[PDB]
């Protein structure tokens, strides 16, 4: 199961990522 | 100009912020 | 700009704090 | 469980990886 | 460019500042 | 629990690897 | 351009200071 | 407690550790 939450708007760019 | 997310991730927490 | 991002790795407590 | 965290935002990278 | 990232794990907290 | 920790300032880059 | 890092462990408290 | 440190900062670089 891998889980991801991203968001980026230019200048912020953020990725969360998990493995279970 | 900001970004806000809260976020409870399978079992993981998480929150983001800018502030201008 | 001031930035927070911040996560519970199970037991784990990690604090992102920028100024850009 | 693994959990990898990954943001840039001005001039800033921070990248943190935690196993659980 | 003042950056801190800050973390504890099991009985170990730290602190770490970059300053540019 | 095992953590790795890694900014990138431009040329100033900082890894931090914490073990309990 | 300054790096710090300082850790703490209960009866234990460290640090390292890094310059150029 | 295993704690790595090394960072390449301008013209330098400092590598260090903690063990506890």
């Known amino acids: 199961v891998k889980v991801k939450v991203k968001v980026k708007v230019x ?4 990725k969360v990522k998990v493995k279970v």
């Open 11 to 14: 200048p912020t760019k953020v």
